[PDB]
Amino acid sequence: LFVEGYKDADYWLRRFEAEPLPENTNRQLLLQFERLVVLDYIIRNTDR
Amino acid sequence: LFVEGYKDADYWLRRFEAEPLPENTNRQLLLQFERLVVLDYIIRNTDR
Amino acid sequence: SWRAYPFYWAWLPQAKVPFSQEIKDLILPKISDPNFVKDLEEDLYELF
Numbered sequence A, B: 001l002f003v004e005g006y007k008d009a010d011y012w013l014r015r016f017e018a019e020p021l022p023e024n025t026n027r028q029l030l031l032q033f034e035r036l037v038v039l040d041y042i043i044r045n046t047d048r
Numbered sequence C: 001s002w003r004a005y006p007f008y009w010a011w012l013p014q015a016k017v018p019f020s021q022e023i024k025d026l027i028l029p030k031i032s033d034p035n036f037v038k039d040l041e042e043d044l045y046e047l048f
């Protein structure tokens, strides 16, 4: 399935270094980031 | 009023530099920090 | 070699944050349950 209006992770990451996120959004981002860690770790992605 | 079990803010902030905090606690720190900022700015503290 | 296929997100500052309670609650019941893990291998086998 196709998903709309996403960007390269590090496009935003670089921007968040420059202009940080409000903390509530940042917490949200981390919640999501953790789900990526779990996924990549279990399947042991060789290419992330 | 004397408050019990605090340390110099920098003692912790540098410890939160090695160990970062869990995000929920960190959100709490920031919430408190914002209140510090508001207070010191309105009274234009000279010595913080 | 352990250097060969890194998880690139491990270098991000976000990767320094202890896991939240949210992820522990979503994942631990599942992956610490031998039945769940066995269902997973089953589902995967079925696909592969």
Ligand SMILES: Nc1ncnc2c1ncn2[C@@H]1O[C@H](COP(=O)(O)OP(=O)(O)O)[C@@H](O)[C@H]1O
Binding pocket: A001, A002, A003, A004, A006
């Ligand atoms: N489901 C999707 N929704 C939106 N964009 C996608 C989706 N899948 C892939 N893309 C975009 O299209 C490009 C090609 O997709 P993919 O083949 O998955 O990556 P790669 O080019 O690294 O093999 C990617 O750079 C990605 O940004």
Ligand SMILES: Nc1ncnc2c1ncn2[C@@H]1O[C@H](COP(=O)(O)OP(=O)(O)O)[C@@H](O)[C@H]1O
Binding pocket: B001, B002, B003, B004
């Ligand atoms: N309300 C308070 N509760 C607990 N500890 C305090 C409180 N106020 C000051 N302290 C501690 O005692 C010391 C008091 O010094 P401070 O309040 O900076 O005034 P001064 O520098 O004039 O002595 C500080 O080092 C601080 O760690």
